[PDB]
Amino acid sequence: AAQKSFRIKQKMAKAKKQNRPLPQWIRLRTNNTIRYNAKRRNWRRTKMNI
Amino acid sequence: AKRTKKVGITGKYGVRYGSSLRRQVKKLEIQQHARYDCSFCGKKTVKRGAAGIWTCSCCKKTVAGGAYTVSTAAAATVRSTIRRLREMVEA
Amino acid sequence: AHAQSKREGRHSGYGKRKGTREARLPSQVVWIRRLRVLRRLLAKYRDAGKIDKHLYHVLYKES
Amino acid sequence: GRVIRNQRKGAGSIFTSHTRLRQGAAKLRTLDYAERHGYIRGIVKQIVHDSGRGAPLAKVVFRDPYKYRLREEIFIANEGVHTGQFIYAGKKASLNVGNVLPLGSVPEGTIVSNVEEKPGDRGALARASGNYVIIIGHNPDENKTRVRLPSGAKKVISSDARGVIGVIAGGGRVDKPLLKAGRAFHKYRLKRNSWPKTRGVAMNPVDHPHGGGNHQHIGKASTISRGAVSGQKAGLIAARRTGLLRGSQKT
Amino acid sequence: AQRVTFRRRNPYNTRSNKIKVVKTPGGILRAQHVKKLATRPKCGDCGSALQGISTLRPRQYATVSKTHKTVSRAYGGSRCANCVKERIIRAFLIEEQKIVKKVVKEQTEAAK
Amino acid sequence: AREITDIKQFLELTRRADVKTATVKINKKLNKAGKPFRQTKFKVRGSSSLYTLVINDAGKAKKLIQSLPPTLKVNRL
Amino acid sequence: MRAKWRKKRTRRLKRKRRKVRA
RNA sequence: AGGAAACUCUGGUGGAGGCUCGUAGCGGUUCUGACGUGCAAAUCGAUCGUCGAAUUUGGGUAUAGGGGCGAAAGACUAAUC
RNA sequence: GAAAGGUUCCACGUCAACAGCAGUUGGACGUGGGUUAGUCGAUCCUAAGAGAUGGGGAAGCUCCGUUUCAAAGGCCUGAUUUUAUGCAGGCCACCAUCGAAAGGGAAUCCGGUUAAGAUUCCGGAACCUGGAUAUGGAUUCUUCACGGUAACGUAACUGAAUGUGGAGACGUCGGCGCGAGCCCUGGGAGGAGUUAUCUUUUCUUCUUAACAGCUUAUCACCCCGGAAUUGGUUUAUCCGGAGAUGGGGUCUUAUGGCUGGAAGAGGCCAGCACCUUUGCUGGCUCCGGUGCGCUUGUGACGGCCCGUGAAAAUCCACAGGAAGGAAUAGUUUUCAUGCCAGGUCGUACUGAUAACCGCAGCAGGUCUCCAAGGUGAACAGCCUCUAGUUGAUAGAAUAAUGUAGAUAAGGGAAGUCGGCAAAAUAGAUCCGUAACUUCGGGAUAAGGAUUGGCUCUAAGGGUCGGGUACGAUCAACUUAGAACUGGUACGGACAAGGGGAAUCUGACUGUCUAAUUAAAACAUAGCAUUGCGAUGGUCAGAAAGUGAUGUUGACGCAAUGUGA
Ligand SMILES: [Mg+2]
Ligand SMILES: [Mg+2]
Ligand SMILES: [Mg+2]
Ligand SMILES: [Mg+2]
Ligand SMILES: [Mg+2]
Ligand SMILES: [Mg+2]
Ligand SMILES: [Mg+2]
Ligand SMILES: [Mg+2]
Ligand SMILES: [Mg+2]
Ligand SMILES: [Mg+2]
Ligand SMILES: [Mg+2]
Ligand SMILES: [Mg+2]
Ligand SMILES: [Mg+2]
Ligand SMILES: [Mg+2]
Ligand SMILES: [Mg+2]
Ligand SMILES: [Mg+2]
Ligand SMILES: [Mg+2]
Ligand SMILES: [Mg+2]
Ligand SMILES: [Mg+2]
Ligand SMILES: [Mg+2]
Ligand SMILES: [Mg+2]
Ligand SMILES: [Mg+2]
Ligand SMILES: [Mg+2]
Ligand SMILES: [Mg+2]
Ligand SMILES: [Mg+2]
Ligand SMILES: [Mg+2]
Ligand SMILES: [Mg+2]
Ligand SMILES: [Mg+2]
Ligand SMILES: [Mg+2]
Ligand SMILES: [Mg+2]
Ligand SMILES: [Mg+2]
Ligand SMILES: [Mg+2]
Ligand SMILES: [Mg+2]
Ligand SMILES: [Mg+2]
Ligand SMILES: [Mg+2]
Ligand SMILES: [Mg+2]
Ligand SMILES: [Mg+2]
Ligand SMILES: [Mg+2]
Ligand SMILES: [Mg+2]
Ligand SMILES: [Mg+2]
Ligand SMILES: [Mg+2]
Ligand SMILES: [Mg+2]
Ligand SMILES: [Mg+2]
Ligand SMILES: [Mg+2]
Ligand SMILES: [Mg+2]
Ligand SMILES: [Mg+2]
Ligand SMILES: [Mg+2]
Ligand SMILES: [Mg+2]
Ligand SMILES: [Mg+2]
Ligand SMILES: [Mg+2]
Ligand SMILES: [Mg+2]
Ligand SMILES: [Mg+2]
Ligand SMILES: [Mg+2]
Ligand SMILES: [Mg+2]
Ligand SMILES: [Mg+2]
Ligand SMILES: [Mg+2]
Ligand SMILES: [Mg+2]
Ligand SMILES: [Mg+2]
Ligand SMILES: [Mg+2]
Ligand SMILES: [Mg+2]
Ligand SMILES: [Mg+2]
Ligand SMILES: [Zn+2]
Ligand SMILES: [Zn+2]
């Protein structure tokens, strides 16, 4: 909603900061196992349930 | 002209609910929607606000009375015997 | 042009009315116009002095 | 079987009385000192309608004898009380319609209302519209007055009990047919959720003792013992007799 | 034939959300939220509107002067003029009646 | 947002020690259909209100302008 | 209001008499 | 206007009703129509019921499993009774 | 816009996956930007209700209860000027808290501005609260104002405790009055369109906010006066010796008018210009009219109820008279001006045939505000203006069978379980209308006629006019009639009842098996029966110093049956 609480807006801000791909220099580290962001979230496919 | 022969105020009910019930509500609705003489100002201004509340439009007095009449016969005879017993308690 | 012809009186027969006469013009507002006219005229005549109050009262009642 | 409807009524979830539009409990003035040693005078400021009650209320204003202020008691209006009327409440009060004399100081045949059972409960008896209590007689020794209640019963209460002189206003209400489920709806809408009423014989046997069967019928006798338990008391509880009441009831 | 919108976040037609259409100097129509209308103060006895008193919301009476809230009589902004008159008459008359009751009830039992 | 109808109240107003600015606005008006005249408005910006004085005579307008204090910042438009 | 108003009134009067005391 | 009176009659005014025709709305009769691996785990179209109230409805709040709620169908209680 | 979602909003780059075809596009992918408040909300108040504490239960998790078997606290003045804040005093008895982004509630409007924000930013103009305070004004030697017969008036014109009153604060429907906006329309000043012909023509601009000053009103009230020959008066019939009509006044300022705000703004045009920031310079923005019009607000009324249609916070006033008070001086800051500050959180966007929920970019569902013109009774159906879309895999052919929509000679229900389905009827005006009836209805009963266009006629109004009958002028759509006319057509599309005679059943309106049964079932009013006078009846709870009915009291509560 537009008139929202600060707790909800803070969780929304954290989700906006988390919604990003990998920094591609991480695939260059030795003994790297991470290929992509498996915890990626889109607003059309899954809801935060908050 | 005279629009209805006998239903009177109960013509708003149409053909419903039965004639013998419409007769009772006629006899009571005439009483609760009639005007009455104010015993204080002397005018024909007393009207029912709610069941038991009879207020005068002129003098703004409000009397507790019957549900459909301003005074019931039981209240009248109680007032009479109370007056008589008050007159008797000195004698 | 249609409003001009209607003001002049065309397009008003029975084949052009789809609502009742009361729906087109209420008999209540016709009566209200009539009563206001009569009461206004009676007050004008009384305040001009062409009629007295005793005639004005019975004319008010039968109007 | 389920818990039946009259058994559910005591939990008071949706069966509480709707008390939003009520002016307060209509009680008598407290029997402090003036009412038992003399009288006190109040004034009827307004006679108002109370929701969910057939009788009108009267807002009587007294002066506090111990502090400079005004107290407002809510009486049930007796038939004939008007606004601006002076109400006299006490032992030395005069016998007039609206006064709150104790029952020891009224003669026989006095018509009173809003009568106390014990002195100090501020009105319990004869509070519905059109009802009244008659004083049958006195007992100076063993200071009790015998009274006839609206039910026809005869009680023996203290002569220090109080009562408003007259008849409760709003009488003759039930003499009018309601004519309509709508009117009954609006009547009960401000009292409580006790309307409409489904017959138990039209229910299922999980819902009522009378329910079930290929025809709508009660089955066993509808007269229930007083010693029955909750869930069974659906019918005529402890009926001494039944059927149409012919002749006088030998009251 | 312009159409307007609410200027606040309340989308409902409640009493605190009454609007009036005005025309701005920009030449457009726009809603304008109006506060609820005020009720005239009433006499304590007769319950009629007191004349001489301004009609405001209760917090606005803190901003106006004493002239807008009173008249220049006893029970000025509280009671009607006729109510003040009849209570003055009642006071004087029944205090005189109290005096004559005092002297007659004194003299009867003084004689007896 | 107020109007003043006396030149000497305007004069005692323009030296109120909180007045900083004034504005003289010229308008072309028509009193009747044959006489287009020149109206002047003297708007003093007080600390809480704007006081406007309306003059329709150019002689009184220019005499008032000469009688204006020098320390007041005026704006001609 | 009227209570904080009366208190502000008495505070102003007390400050005026206390500063004119000297 | 009539009548001796009781009172009757005529023409208006008025705008009552869990009145009525019929929108929005609410519901869901019939075609036992469409669809029936659907647009849809109940929809679509027409035909219908009702439409000033025993009306419709948002939000808040209360009642919880042998319990609740039920104008009562063993109905509903998160596609579950 | 609310809920909900949460960055989907906007820009740049971009097409591997998604957009059930495609894709250079996207609510997709990648990278960034964006939500500015003393005045809008939350915050404060209390509603239904939730819920600690004191207590009492319970082995206990915990239960009851919300003012109760409580020693339940804080408020103003000061006095003191080791001084802090005790002691001097005095008042006060509610008795936690939470609970509404739609209830209550202090205060803000206009213009402009961004890629994306605005009642928040910029400019201008205001207002409220809280706090400081000085000057002016007012008042006083008759200390705490004067005037008016009065209703009451004003720039002000002490007032503690305590008490009282008012506002906050209230249903629904009907019609009537008034106002605002819109619609319609005349003249004029501009611009645009059509122009074979016609059209002083068609379209469009001509606007004025919050706030402030003056004025402005139905109702109500005051003074004079004394009314039957009863008068005044509403659409609606109520009022008057408890003082009418009438004459003169008083008041509320919803609302409207003038002025300021404010033309400087905004709008419509013309001309001059130039890589250009791009402007600059001129004009005009005026005066009206109408109404059963639409929407909305409000007022005075009236109808309805065994229905009479929230509370608190908050603010003001009054009664009272505590205390303090002037004369060489004061006393006042509800009058004017002047100074300072106004925190925290939200603020973008969608709000749905793509941003929510339904496994999804699902024909489903999901609360509400604004609502142009014509036809027409009508926010019906149909067409158009402003605004918005032109989205849904497409192309070519036109077999059968389908789905949707139709039409059919003669017959007219022979079809079929059954007139299912479809057809017919339909609007308005006039005429006419039966049995039966609870006398209210039945009833649009049944059953007939008419309906277009054009040219006329008649009737139905307002405002001004008269020493101490009428005339002038302006403007309405309502009804009725008459010719004439036409391939007898005309509610010409749209829209829009089939009817009657009976029987069974339920009195009716209403309700239910969401997702196979809407019914004769349920309910209902009415009727009847039963229990109960409070140490009580019915019911709840593990228990309780526990509860529901009950803010109740037999015209009541509780339990049943029958169903006008
Ligand atoms: Mg004609
Ligand atoms: Mg009409
Ligand atoms: Mg009529
Ligand atoms: Mg119920
Ligand atoms: Mg029943
Ligand atoms: Mg059954
Ligand atoms: Mg059983
Ligand atoms: Mg059975
Ligand atoms: Mg059965
Ligand atoms: Mg005043
Ligand atoms: Mg005033
Ligand atoms: Mg109906
Ligand atoms: Mg209907
Ligand atoms: Mg519909
Ligand atoms: Mg369907
Ligand atoms: Mg099918
Ligand atoms: Mg198929
Ligand atoms: Mg069964
Ligand atoms: Mg289910
Ligand atoms: Mg594709
Ligand atoms: Mg592709
Ligand atoms: Mg986008
Ligand atoms: Mg608890
Ligand atoms: Mg709170
Ligand atoms: Mg709120
Ligand atoms: Mg609110
Ligand atoms: Mg409210
Ligand atoms: Mg925006
Ligand atoms: Mg600003
Ligand atoms: Mg003065
Ligand atoms: Mg009030
Ligand atoms: Mg009403
Ligand atoms: Mg203006
Ligand atoms: Mg404002
Ligand atoms: Mg008079
Ligand atoms: Mg105003
Ligand atoms: Mg509306
Ligand atoms: Mg924003
Ligand atoms: Mg926004
Ligand atoms: Mg939006
Ligand atoms: Mg919407
Ligand atoms: Mg939309
Ligand atoms: Mg979704
Ligand atoms: Mg899900
Ligand atoms: Mg609308
Ligand atoms: Mg029309
Ligand atoms: Mg339409
Ligand atoms: Mg498709
Ligand atoms: Mg054929
Ligand atoms: Mg057949
Ligand atoms: Mg056959
Ligand atoms: Mg056959
Ligand atoms: Mg057969
Ligand atoms: Mg059919
Ligand atoms: Mg028939
Ligand atoms: Mg039925
Ligand atoms: Mg079903
Ligand atoms: Mg069905
Ligand atoms: Mg039944
Ligand atoms: Mg009990
Ligand atoms: Mg029985
Ligand atoms: Zn009276
Ligand atoms: Zn009064």
Could you characterize the architecture of this molecule?
- The structure is cut from a larger assembly and holds seven protein chains of seven kinds.
- With 50 residues, chain A is mainly α.
- Chain A has one helix and no strands.
- Chain D is mainly beta and 251 residues long.
- Chain D contains three helices and eleven strands, in the order ααβββββββββαββ.
- In chain D, the strands form three sheets. Chain D has a five-stranded antiparallel β-sheet, with no helix packed on it. A four-stranded antiparallel β-sheet of chain D has the order 3-2-1-4. Chain D has a two-stranded parallel ribbon with strand order 10-11.
- In chain D, β2 (57-63) and β3 (70-76) form a beta hairpin.
- Chain E has one helix at residues 81-111, and strands spanning 19-23, 29-33.
- Chain E has a two-stranded antiparallel ribbon.
- With 112 residues, chain E is an alpha+beta fold.
- Helix content of chain E is 28%, strand content 9%.
- By secondary structure, chain G is mostly helical.
- Chain G has one helix and no strands.
- The longest helix of chain G is centred in the middle third of the chain and has 19 residues, at 3-21.
- Chain G is rod-shaped and about 30 Å long.
- Classes of the chains: A mainly alpha (50), B alpha+beta (91), C mainly alpha (63), D mainly beta (251), E alpha+beta (112), F alpha/beta (77), G mainly alpha (22).
- Chains in contact: B-D.
- The interface between B and D is large, with 33 and 40 residues.
- The structure holds magnesium ion (61 copies) and zinc ion (2 copies).
- One magnesium ion (MG) is lined by residues 1, 205, 209 of chain D.
- Chain D binds two RNA strands through α1, α3, β10 and β11.
List keywords for this structure.
7 chains; F: 77 residues; alpha/beta; five-stranded mixed sheet; 5 strands; G: 22 residues; mainly alpha; binds magnesium ion; binds zinc ion; RNA-binding
Can you give me a brief rundown of this structure?
The structure is cut from a larger assembly and holds seven protein chains of seven kinds. Chain C is an all-alpha fold.
